[PDB]
Write a protein that binds this ligand. Structure first.
Ligand SMILES: C[S@@+](CC[C@H](N)C(=O)[O-])C[C@H]1O[C@@H](n2cnc3c(N)ncnc32)[C@H](O)[C@@H]1O
Length: 256
């Protein structure tokens, strides 16, 4: 039984009250107040459509993934990753795909900087999509479940699905459950082949063990995963630490 499975265990034992306090204890989060109010009023410039823009920004600003050329954004949802990438100088095209329907967030149309190189497509299950030529492959798919065996299946399926889209390109791929032994085996094989490293984003909630496989880095995957399991387990032991609040991203207007 992995450290991660013990964390998962404990998480599942929490009351809703305890869960709600635990999930943000000591994390970082952006202040969405202004964006939500603006989106509520139909504003199409400046605002990120989700917390995802700031989440991907954290990786990009640290050069862990450097979006360039034609960017594919797998499970776009509202489009946070896509609209962010749209403003980056090296990026020439952004194609986002997402399931949508009941479920499942629909793309939100925006006119933030670079919106003209963006096409977001709903009604698209990426497990049935053939791979396309791209210079950057982004994927933020992986639905949490109380069952770590369900999550293991979802995670492995994502890893197998994204591989053909990796063509010596930049990438950032969510790994929903990185602690199950079989997932580690796949990750180790993929890292041998395509390189990169697994990284914990500080904007991730404590309610998920997700880490991101990014292209620009190196390191020991097992050590990084266990570090996260120890972090998340430690956060069970103390009174709720209020999250570190940061400014949300401002995404423009205009064409590129
Ligand atoms: C964590 S959200 C992405 C948030 C996005 N990165 C943003 O910045 O707003 C993952 C998205 O994947 C979508 N999704 C889940 N399974 C999918 C599938 N099989 N094919 C396409 N999209 C999927 C979900 O509907 C959800 O909108």
């Amino acid at each position: 039984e992995t450290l991660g499975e013990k964390w998962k265990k404990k998480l599942n034992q929490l009351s809703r009250k305890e869960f709600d306090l635990y999930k943000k204890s000591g994390i970082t989060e952006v202040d969405r107040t202004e964006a939500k109010e603006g989106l509520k009023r139909g504003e199409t410039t400046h605002h990120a459509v989700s917390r995802g823009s700031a989440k991907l920004q954290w990786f990009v600003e640290r050069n862990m993934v450097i979006p360039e050329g034609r960017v594919i954004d797998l499970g776009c949802g509202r489009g946070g990753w896509s609209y962010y990438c749209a403003g980056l100088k090296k990026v020439t095209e952004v194609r986002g795909y997402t399931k949508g329907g009941p479920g499942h967030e629909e793309p939100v149309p925006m006119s933030t900087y670079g919106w003209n190189i963006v096409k977001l497509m709903s009604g698209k299950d990426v497990f049935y999509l053939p791979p396309e030529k791209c210079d950057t492959l982004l994927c933020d798919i992986g639905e949490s479940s109380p069952s770590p065996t369900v999550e293991e299946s979802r995670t492995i399926r994502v890893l197998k699905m994204v591989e053909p889209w990796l063509k010596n390109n930049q990438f950032c791929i969510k790994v929903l459950n990185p602690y199950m032994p079989t997932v580690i085996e796949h990750l180790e094989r993929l890292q041998r082949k395509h390189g990169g490293m697994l990284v914990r984003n500080p904007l991730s909630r404590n309610s998920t063990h997700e880490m991101y496989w990014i292209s620009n880095g190196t390191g020991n995957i097992v050590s990084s995963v266990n570090m996260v399991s120890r972090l998340l387990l430690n956060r069970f032991t103390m009174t709720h630490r209020r999250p570190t609040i940061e400014k949300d991203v401002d995404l423009g207007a205009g064409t590129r």
